[PDB]
């Protein structure tokens, strides 16, 4: 199936996922497609930060759902 | 669709509390984890002044005080709580 | 050899030219490659055409690196 991830204002990427994929797996697909290290990624769905070990299923993320990507960066 | 609104509301709260902002160049949402009063955007490499929630520099990049927070120009910090925004 | 080339394509150490579809091997260090056959400009770091059909400068297609100050990819150093 497919899910969407909001990045820049107004911009979305599409990802190829399975209901059983974990959050760490999704962040790996984001890194492959967008070049953002997984340790910098925080994913949000329906107002909740997603935990690396749970799966799209646990969070009730279905086809055409939309996640929001936030960058978590270290201060200088 | 209740999902979308819950996420919009969460982001609104993050912005209001100062826990997140939009990168002023590329408009991705960024959060700062630890460290000093500045971060560099991963997407576009813009330096961001966290304590004023805005760009550190003008369009010429690092060194360009024609815009940005102008920390220490004429000796004046960009914010009274600034310790180091680069 | 052709067998190793098959694996490089499989593994992403090679790509097909976006204009002419011939196999293009990686130029280590470089974010840009000029195809040796059709001479089109390739953005290696995004694995796509550097430009639209109008050629160099045409940001109606391609990776649009540096438009509005935004690099085409966080790892890009210079894709021309
Ligand atoms: Cl900058
Ligand atoms: Zn940015
Ligand atoms: Zn500042
Ligand atoms: Zn400052
Ligand atoms: Zn070619
Ligand atoms: Zn490029
Ligand atoms: Zn580039």
Author numbering:
A (entry chain C): 1 to 76
B (entry chain A): 425 to 510
C (entry chain B): 431 to 510
What does the paper say about this structure?
HOIL-1 is a RING-between-RING-family E3 ubiquitin ligase and a component of the linear ubiquitin chain assembly complex. RBR E3 ubiquitin ligases like HOIL-1 catalyse ubiquitination in a two-step mechanism where ubiquitin is first transferred from the E2 active site Cys to the E3 active site Cys before being transferred to the substrate. We identify a critical catalytic histidine residue, His510, in the flexible catalytic site of HOIL-1 that enables this O-linked ubiquitination and prohibits ubiquitin discharge onto lysine sidechains.
First, we attempted to crystallise the HOIL-1 (C460A) RING2 domain with His-ubiquitin-maltose to obtain insights into how HOIL-1 may ubiquitinate maltose. We crystallised HOIL-1 RING/ubiquitin-maltose under the same conditions as HOIL-1 RING2/ubiquitin and successfully determined the X-ray structure to 1.7 Å resolution. Although we can resolve the ubiquitin C terminus, we do not observe clear electron density for the ubiquitin-conjugated maltose molecule and therefore were unable to build the maltose molecule into the model, despite intact mass spectrometry confirming that the vast majority of the ubiquitin in crystals grown under identical conditions is conjugated to maltose. (D) Intact mass spectrometry analysis of redissolved crystals taken from two different crystallisation drops shows that most (>75%) of ubiquitin present in the crystals is conjugated to maltose.
